[PDB]
Amino acid sequence: NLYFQSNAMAAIDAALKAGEKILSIYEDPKSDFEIADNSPLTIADRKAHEAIVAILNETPFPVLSEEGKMDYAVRRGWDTLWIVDPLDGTKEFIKRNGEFTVNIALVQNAVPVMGVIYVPVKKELYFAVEGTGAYKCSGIVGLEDEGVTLQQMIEKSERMPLADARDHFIAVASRSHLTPETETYIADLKKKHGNVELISSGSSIKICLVAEGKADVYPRFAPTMEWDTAAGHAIARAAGMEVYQAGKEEPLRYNKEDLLNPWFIVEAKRE
Ligand SMILES: [Cl-]
């Protein structure tokens, strides 16, 4: 409004702050990645959550976090809310494969309208605001001490999708064990498309790859939680893509009674 842009900035600020907390643990030679209350993962997720809510609690909108303490009855009346996963990609983190993410979405009337994904190891930030665009900012660790604004972030970032035409079809999969349902769909894609390539990336980067134009489709026929898709879904939408409920024409919906997502497919917005 006069306020939406400031909320977007808050999400970016929060994601970077969380990123710092996570990376400090990830990079610490004293961290014991063989460890639970005192596991590196548990501590990082908690510190990330704390960094994020320190900012988001100040905003006018309530917070639904993966690391937060609540009943559906409480949140069912929240028309606008933050949906957050402070640290997605458990295996990426604990096995030190490096493609874990911070995920912050603003959801309004069950639709993700702003999203931020930060990839702390890679210092890659994706963000989007419905009606403005989706953007990628590479090489960012934190904000300057002075002068930083959303308008400046947008100016300095790359609008998505990023232009590079290719004549071949690309699908993206997890680096973890794929479900037989996902593998079956991919097998069918491989039969349908003569010039097919598969690529893989951690966490919600898979949604980002479609938004970037680096992949045509990200099918996930596996259980995931709202907080792991919401941010990427906002980003996808602002890039001309969509995150469909697999087998339906309807996008994934949010702030549901059950926070599990159904199967989804990220692809270009249909006709
Ligand atoms: Cl899968």
Instruction: State the CATH number of the domain containing residue 270.
Output: 3.40.190.80
193 CB-contact burial (10 Å; exposed 0-12 / middle 13-18 / buried 19+): middle
Q: From ligand 1's centre to the CA of 116, what distance in Å?
A: 23
188 is in an annotated binding site: no
Chain centroid to Cα 68, Å, comes to 18
89 is in an annotated binding site: yes
Residues 74, 92, single domain; the answer is: yes
Residue with tokens 């999708």: 161
Which alpha helices (DSSP H) does the chain contain, by range?
A: 4-27, 40-56, 72-75, 90-94, 150-156, 180-192, 205-212, 226-238
- Domain final residue pick, 139, 159, 179: 159
Residues 174, 220, single domain; the answer is: yes
Contacts of 70 (CB under 8 A, 6+ apart): 64
Task: Report the amino acid identity of residue 5.
Answer: Q
- Domain final residue pick, 159, 176, 209: 159
Q: From ligand 1's centre to the CA of 102, what distance in Å?
A: 20
167 is in an annotated binding site: no
- The angstrom resolution of this structure is 1.7
* Helix%, strand%, coil% for the chain, nearest 5: 35, 25, 40
Residues 20, 112, single domain; the answer is: yes
88 is in an annotated binding site: yes
Residues 169, 153, single domain; the answer is: no
Residues 94, 68, single domain; the answer is: yes
Domain that holds residue 249: 161-271
Degrees to nearest 5, angle at CA 233 with 230 and 234: 90
Strand-pairing partners, residue 199, are 172
Q: From ligand 1's centre to the CA of 221, what distance in Å?
A: 6
Q: From ligand 1's centre to the CA of 245, what distance in Å?
A: 15
Q: From ligand 1's centre to the CA of 235, what distance in Å?
A: 21
Write the CATH number for 140. Answer: 3.30.540.10
242 is in an annotated binding site: no
Spatial distance between the Cα atoms of 174 and 206, rounded to a whole number of angstroms = 8
Task: Report the amino acid identity of residue 13.
Answer: D
Q: Between the CA of residue 84 and those of 56, 166, 246, what are the distances in Å?
A: 10, 34, 23
Residues 168, 127, single domain; the answer is: no
Spatial distance between the Cα atoms of 205 and 211, rounded to a whole number of angstroms = 10
Residues 216, 133, single domain; the answer is: no
Residues 74, 111, single domain; the answer is: yes
Per the structure, how many domains does the chain have?
2
Candidates 84, 139, 92; CA nearest to 114 is 84
Degrees to nearest 5, angle at CA 208 with 203 and 209: 100
Residues 137, 233, single domain; the answer is: no
3-state secondary structure of 179: coil
- Domain final residue pick, 141, 159, 177: 159
Chain centroid to Cα 243, Å, comes to 12
Degrees to nearest 5, angle at CA 135 with 132 and 138: 155
Q: Which two tokens stand for residue 145?
A: 């001490």
Q: Are 59 and 82 in contact (CB under 8 A)?
A: yes
Method of elucidation: X-ray
Residues 43, 174, single domain; the answer is: no
Residues 184, 119, single domain; the answer is: no
Residues 18, 147, single domain; the answer is: yes
Q: From ligand 1's centre to the CA of 263, what distance in Å?
A: 10
